[PDB]
Amino acid sequence: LRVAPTVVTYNTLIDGLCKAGKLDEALKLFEEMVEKGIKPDVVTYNTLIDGLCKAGKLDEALKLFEEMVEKGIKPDVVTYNTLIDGLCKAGKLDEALKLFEEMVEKGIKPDVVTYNTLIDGLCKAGKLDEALKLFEEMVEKGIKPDVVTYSTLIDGLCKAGKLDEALKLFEEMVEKGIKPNVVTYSTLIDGLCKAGKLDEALKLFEMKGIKPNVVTYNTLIDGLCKAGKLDEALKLFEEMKGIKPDVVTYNTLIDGLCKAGKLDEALKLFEEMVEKGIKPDVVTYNTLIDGLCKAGKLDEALKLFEEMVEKGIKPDVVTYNTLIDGLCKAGLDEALKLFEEMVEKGIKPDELTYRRVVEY
RNA sequence: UUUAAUUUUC
């Protein structure tokens, strides 16, 4: 191997490890390169900063930003976009809108991605009419709205129940010549399904030839289970081909079948999951722990939760919130014992976590 | 190197 390894090799390696998901491996290269005479650059800082935001170490991300500036490695548009996205997705919207101000004070033009990144945050922050302002502002600066832009607004409008305006934006997109893709059509197929418009969802799935992927089939499967067509969704899972089901496919059906009472069927799909080399994440165990609790069967729910940690999947706010619920409803001290444990392990409690225990 | 879609606690 060793030709002098560049910065670009360490930058490829560090990104690769960041996604994913051995972040601790990544940062020891970052050290190992600086001790070797190889100086990290703007892209080396941006990689790690995005790695650390995805792994939810946002506060540790801004440490590295501080460190770049100190070094006189200037943060560029990308560094700022990584930060603006990371802050939105950790719920720091107004922090993120600060950096949007600061970018311009430093002579950095905001981007197509910067506007996309912020229109997304705005939409997900229940602020649609600000999202549509930022969309008016790109055009004012002739930054061409693209397929990620339109797909985001459409998602936005659907998730606010504003379905017939999403449809109206999909039309506009095409006559304006930005072509939809699998993600466009599959947000819309998410829309229509969530508005009880299953026929319409399937009629959009027919899409030019955009090849549906596993997400579009998970949309329809979830659409079918919620509408109570469990065997039409077991059919589509068969299916109407070449798409390998993944972990969400099984969770969606595991939930559908739990809700229905078909706990036999579900658990065999959960047993089938692992035979086919699809590891059960935190949501598979969540979905069942709920099903078992609400079916009155709190013993087996707890079995599953112990087994969770016999395996490697670490619990969740949902895990604890669900068991908290079921434990209290199962006629308190243990519910409260789970709550202490949730604080030691490192998970932060949410409103419901509080709302339940209290309401003692 | 950075942005959009589907699953679990209603």
XYZ file of N, CA, C and O in Angstrom, chain A residues 100-209:
440
model
N -28.144 30.563 8.162
C -28.609 31.094 6.881
C -28.273 32.626 6.755
O -27.886 33.085 5.683
N -28.392 33.391 7.852
C -27.968 34.843 7.940
C -26.468 35.016 7.861
O -25.971 35.870 7.126
N -25.758 34.208 8.639
C -24.297 34.265 8.757
C -23.540 33.935 7.476
O -22.493 34.555 7.203
N -24.045 32.954 6.712
C -23.529 32.623 5.380
C -23.410 33.841 4.526
O -22.366 34.041 3.919
N -24.481 34.624 4.444
C -24.433 35.854 3.663
C -23.536 36.941 4.289
O -22.998 37.770 3.565
N -23.311 36.933 5.573
C -22.464 37.946 6.095
C -21.040 37.658 5.728
O -20.245 38.552 5.571
N -20.718 36.396 5.563
C -19.352 36.013 5.161
C -19.071 35.949 3.675
O -17.951 35.646 3.310
N -20.031 36.300 2.822
C -19.785 36.405 1.372
C -20.061 35.110 0.612
O -19.707 34.980 -0.570
N -20.700 34.161 1.299
C -21.100 32.882 0.730
C -22.506 33.071 0.200
O -23.393 33.507 0.954
N -22.704 32.771 -1.088
C -24.054 32.782 -1.663
C -24.804 31.555 -1.135
O -24.219 30.499 -1.008
N -26.078 31.721 -0.726
C -26.852 30.524 -0.414
C -27.083 29.741 -1.689
O -27.108 30.360 -2.746
N -27.206 28.412 -1.576
C -27.479 27.430 -2.727
C -28.896 26.934 -2.989
O -29.800 27.137 -2.154
N -29.020 26.175 -4.125
C -30.188 25.322 -4.472
C -30.374 24.320 -3.353
O -31.463 24.184 -2.839
N -29.303 23.690 -2.900
C -29.358 22.833 -1.701
C -29.674 23.533 -0.416
O -30.341 22.913 0.414
N -29.126 24.765 -0.202
C -29.398 25.598 0.990
C -30.885 25.900 1.023
O -31.516 25.770 2.075
N -31.454 26.328 -0.107
C -32.878 26.612 -0.114
C -33.722 25.363 0.079
O -34.730 25.419 0.795
N -33.313 24.251 -0.564
C -33.959 22.946 -0.400
C -33.862 22.519 1.054
O -34.856 22.268 1.699
N -32.657 22.386 1.565
C -32.447 22.089 2.989
C -33.374 22.913 3.965
O -33.933 22.328 4.926
N -33.576 24.213 3.700
C -34.397 25.073 4.583
C -35.894 25.015 4.311
O -36.724 25.097 5.244
N -36.267 24.897 3.047
C -37.667 24.627 2.736
C -38.131 23.283 3.355
O -39.252 23.158 3.874
N -37.248 22.295 3.363
C -37.585 21.071 4.047
C -37.843 21.300 5.544
O -38.916 20.975 6.030
N -36.861 21.867 6.252
C -36.983 22.235 7.684
C -38.262 22.988 7.959
O -38.996 22.649 8.854
N -38.546 23.989 7.141
C -39.719 24.804 7.331
C -40.958 23.958 7.261
O -41.813 24.070 8.131
N -41.051 23.088 6.252
C -42.238 22.250 6.032
C -42.426 21.349 7.210
O -43.499 21.368 7.811
N -41.370 20.628 7.582
C -41.394 19.727 8.736
C -41.587 20.407 10.091
O -41.937 19.751 11.063
N -41.344 21.715 10.157
C -41.590 22.521 11.348
C -43.014 23.115 11.372
O -43.290 24.070 12.141
N -43.910 22.553 10.563
C -45.243 23.079 10.387
C -45.212 24.547 10.024
O -45.841 25.343 10.700
N -44.450 24.928 9.004
C -44.467 26.308 8.538
C -44.419 26.364 7.023
O -43.388 26.675 6.420
N -45.576 26.095 6.425
C -45.683 25.923 4.973
C -45.554 27.255 4.249
O -44.812 27.385 3.259
N -46.237 28.262 4.778
C -46.253 29.593 4.144
C -44.877 30.350 4.200
O -44.628 31.247 3.385
N -43.972 29.911 5.080
C -42.541 30.302 5.033
C -41.753 29.506 3.994
O -40.859 30.038 3.334
N -42.068 28.206 3.898
C -41.524 27.319 2.858
C -41.820 27.906 1.485
O -40.882 28.162 0.712
N -43.090 28.205 1.214
C -43.446 28.877 -0.056
C -42.860 30.306 -0.255
O -42.799 30.793 -1.397
N -42.434 30.979 0.822
C -41.714 32.251 0.694
C -40.334 31.985 0.126
O -39.971 32.520 -0.923
N -39.590 31.118 0.807
C -38.251 30.681 0.364
C -38.212 30.134 -1.055
O -37.177 30.196 -1.720
N -39.328 29.554 -1.497
C -39.461 29.115 -2.878
C -39.601 30.309 -3.823
O -38.992 30.320 -4.884
N -40.401 31.304 -3.445
C -40.469 32.594 -4.185
C -39.126 33.329 -4.254
O -38.841 34.018 -5.231
N -38.303 33.147 -3.225
C -37.005 33.851 -3.103
C -35.901 33.269 -3.997
O -35.071 34.042 -4.461
N -35.857 31.946 -4.206
C -34.889 31.320 -5.134
C -35.071 31.876 -6.524
O -34.120 32.239 -7.201
N -36.321 31.925 -6.961
C -36.628 32.348 -8.326
C -36.238 33.814 -8.462
O -35.608 34.178 -9.454
N -36.554 34.622 -7.442
C -36.106 36.046 -7.339
C -34.583 36.194 -7.574
O -34.137 37.164 -8.200
N -33.806 35.231 -7.064
C -32.351 35.134 -7.313
C -31.959 34.203 -8.480
O -30.809 33.772 -8.573
N -32.889 33.907 -9.387
C -32.669 32.893 -10.412
C -31.822 31.661 -10.056
O -30.917 31.287 -10.816
N -32.091 31.047 -8.901
C -31.550 29.727 -8.590
C -32.652 28.822 -9.026
O -33.763 28.947 -8.543
N -32.333 27.902 -9.930
C -33.340 27.046 -10.602
C -33.892 26.041 -9.593
O -33.132 25.254 -9.013
N -35.200 26.095 -9.332
C -35.776 25.030 -8.512
C -35.688 23.728 -9.240
O -35.930 23.701 -10.439
N -35.331 22.678 -8.517
C -35.099 21.388 -9.113
C -36.085 20.336 -8.549
O -37.122 20.675 -7.947
N -35.769 19.067 -8.758
C -36.731 18.009 -8.537
C -36.784 17.726 -7.072
O -37.826 17.315 -6.561
N -35.648 17.882 -6.411
C -35.637 17.885 -4.938
C -36.459 19.062 -4.337
O -37.127 18.891 -3.343
N -36.456 20.219 -4.985
C -37.247 21.369 -4.494
C -38.711 21.045 -4.579
O -39.416 21.078 -3.557
N -39.170 20.729 -5.790
C -40.590 20.421 -5.993
C -41.056 19.220 -5.179
O -42.137 19.227 -4.621
N -40.224 18.210 -5.048
C -40.611 17.040 -4.300
C -40.835 17.316 -2.858
O -41.749 16.765 -2.245
N -40.001 18.200 -2.310
C -40.110 18.714 -0.921
C -41.362 19.530 -0.646
O -42.013 19.327 0.387
N -41.713 20.454 -1.537
C -42.919 21.255 -1.317
C -44.182 20.389 -1.304
O -45.029 20.518 -0.381
N -44.256 19.476 -2.324
C -45.303 18.416 -2.533
C -45.437 17.573 -1.285
O -46.538 17.383 -0.782
N -44.318 17.070 -0.774
C -44.337 16.359 0.496
C -44.975 17.239 1.547
O -45.896 16.788 2.262
N -44.473 18.494 1.625
C -44.979 19.524 2.529
C -46.472 19.714 2.454
O -47.169 19.563 3.450
N -46.960 19.989 1.260
C -48.374 20.233 1.062
C -49.236 18.992 1.398
O -50.305 19.139 1.991
N -48.759 17.787 1.069
C -49.484 16.568 1.421
C -49.554 16.430 2.941
O -50.640 16.316 3.514
N -48.405 16.467 3.596
C -48.353 16.345 5.058
C -49.138 17.461 5.819
O -49.406 17.299 6.999
N -49.513 18.563 5.161
C -50.488 19.497 5.746
C -51.943 19.256 5.298
O -52.814 20.109 5.484
N -52.229 18.100 4.716
C -53.567 17.830 4.192
C -53.932 18.618 2.955
O -55.043 18.503 2.455
N -52.976 19.361 2.409
C -53.218 20.253 1.291
C -52.963 19.450 -0.002
O -52.164 19.843 -0.862
N -53.678 18.336 -0.135
C -53.462 17.377 -1.215
C -53.664 17.929 -2.613
O -52.803 17.765 -3.453
N -54.791 18.593 -2.851
C -55.111 19.137 -4.182
C -54.193 20.301 -4.622
O -54.212 20.717 -5.780
N -53.377 20.822 -3.705
C -52.339 21.797 -4.045
C -51.007 21.111 -4.386
O -50.275 21.590 -5.246
N -50.695 20.003 -3.707
C -49.557 19.122 -4.081
C -49.684 18.633 -5.543
O -48.795 18.854 -6.391
N -50.830 18.026 -5.826
C -51.194 17.621 -7.166
C -50.967 18.823 -8.102
O -50.239 18.697 -9.093
N -51.504 19.994 -7.742
C -51.276 21.249 -8.511
C -49.834 21.653 -8.699
O -49.537 22.391 -9.624
N -48.957 21.231 -7.798
C -47.527 21.517 -7.912
C -46.777 20.495 -8.763
O -45.813 20.856 -9.465
N -47.220 19.230 -8.686
C -46.766 18.156 -9.592
C -47.043 18.455 -11.074
O -46.167 18.289 -11.917
N -48.259 18.890 -11.378
C -48.581 19.373 -12.718
C -47.590 20.443 -13.196
O -47.035 20.345 -14.292
N -47.373 21.454 -12.353
C -46.542 22.624 -12.686
C -45.109 22.223 -12.966
O -44.495 22.653 -13.940
N -44.587 21.391 -12.087
C -43.265 20.821 -12.248
C -43.054 20.320 -13.675
O -42.068 20.715 -14.310
N -43.987 19.501 -14.197
C -43.811 18.865 -15.524
C -43.880 19.888 -16.660
O -43.000 19.899 -17.521
N -44.903 20.742 -16.657
C -45.019 21.794 -17.678
C -43.852 22.793 -17.609
O -43.528 23.425 -18.610
N -43.220 22.914 -16.435
C -41.972 23.689 -16.246
C -40.695 22.844 -16.556
O -39.562 23.360 -16.591
N -40.891 21.541 -16.763
C -39.908 20.681 -17.409
C -38.910 20.033 -16.477
O -37.894 19.535 -16.941
N -39.175 20.037 -15.174
C -38.308 19.365 -14.205
C -38.993 18.036 -14.007
O -40.155 17.997 -13.597
N -38.307 16.942 -14.316
C -39.005 15.667 -14.366
C -39.106 14.994 -13.005
O -38.099 14.897 -12.294
N -40.318 14.499 -12.653
C -40.471 13.714 -11.453
C -39.719 12.416 -11.512
O -39.369 11.917 -12.607
N -39.499 11.870 -10.330
C -38.770 10.660 -10.168
C -39.525 9.780 -9.212
O -40.624 10.130 -8.779
N -38.939 8.628 -8.904
C -39.538 7.643 -8.010
C -39.997 8.260 -6.700
O -41.030 7.853 -6.190
N -39.233 9.246 -6.189
C -39.467 9.905 -4.873
C -40.639 10.889 -4.914
O -41.504 10.803 -4.115
N -40.666 11.792 -5.876
C -41.884 12.531 -6.234
C -43.155 11.675 -6.191
O -44.053 11.934 -5.360
N -43.213 10.644 -7.062
C -44.429 9.792 -7.250
C -44.731 9.067 -5.949
O -45.863 9.014 -5.529
N -43.718 8.524 -5.297
C -43.928 7.869 -4.011
C -44.322 8.764 -2.791
O -44.831 8.203 -1.792
N -44.047 10.097 -2.828
C -44.563 11.025 -1.794
C -46.003 11.192 -2.138
O -46.862 11.030 -1.270
N -46.299 11.488 -3.399
C -47.696 11.623 -3.766
C -48.495 10.352 -3.453
O -49.647 10.448 -3.062
N -47.887 9.174 -3.612
C -48.586 7.896 -3.378
C -48.712 7.744 -1.855
O -49.691 7.153 -1.362
N -47.763 8.312 -1.104
C -47.970 8.514 0.378
C -49.114 9.448 0.705
O -49.919 9.177 1.606
N -49.207 10.541 -0.028
C -50.313 11.462 0.196
C -51.658 10.775 0.080
O -52.339 10.513 1.066
N -51.992 10.453 -1.155
C -53.261 9.865 -1.501
C -53.636 8.704 -0.548
O -54.737 8.660 -0.052
N -52.706 7.805 -0.258
C -52.974 6.713 0.675
C -53.403 7.241 2.044
O -54.413 6.779 2.581
N -52.670 8.227 2.596
C -52.995 8.796 3.919
C -54.332 9.557 3.938
O -54.991 9.600 4.984
N -54.742 10.133 2.804
C -56.093 10.711 2.648
C -57.200 9.689 2.275
O -58.200 10.055 1.652
N -57.035 8.411 2.619
C -58.041 7.425 2.286
C -58.334 7.259 0.801
O -59.394 6.722 0.449
N -57.407 7.689 -0.062
C -57.575 7.679 -1.522
C -56.689 6.572 -2.094
O -55.715 6.837 -2.803
N -57.021 5.334 -1.757
C -56.248 4.158 -2.205
C -56.321 3.856 -3.687
O -55.309 3.509 -4.273
N -57.513 3.961 -4.274
C -57.669 3.768 -5.727
C -56.712 4.716 -6.450
O -55.931 4.312 -7.318
N -56.741 5.973 -6.027
C -55.965 7.024 -6.671
C -54.445 6.752 -6.553
O -53.695 6.895 -7.525
N -54.004 6.379 -5.351
C -52.630 5.942 -5.108
C -52.173 4.854 -6.070
O -51.086 4.961 -6.624
N -53.011 3.822 -6.273
C -52.689 2.689 -7.188
C -52.674 3.163 -8.621
O -51.784 2.769 -9.372
N -53.622 4.035 -8.984
C -53.642 4.658 -10.318
C -52.440 5.560 -10.599
O -52.149 5.831 -11.736
N -51.752 6.057 -9.586
C -50.523 6.783 -9.833
C -49.352 5.826 -9.972
O -48.433 6.093 -10.725
N -49.389 4.727 -9.222
C -48.382 3.644 -9.300
C -48.257 2.917 -10.678
O -47.218 2.326 -10.962
N -49.276 3.030 -11.508
C -49.271 2.435 -12.817
C -48.109 2.957 -13.598
O -48.236 3.976 -14.240
N -44.114 4.864 -13.847
C -45.311 5.391 -13.209
C -46.212 6.014 -14.243
O -47.339 6.380 -13.966
N -44.289 8.304 -17.557
C -43.282 7.471 -18.194
C -42.805 6.381 -17.273
O -43.255 6.229 -16.152
N -41.868 5.616 -17.761
C -41.386 4.490 -17.001
C -40.436 4.805 -15.882
O -39.226 4.692 -16.050
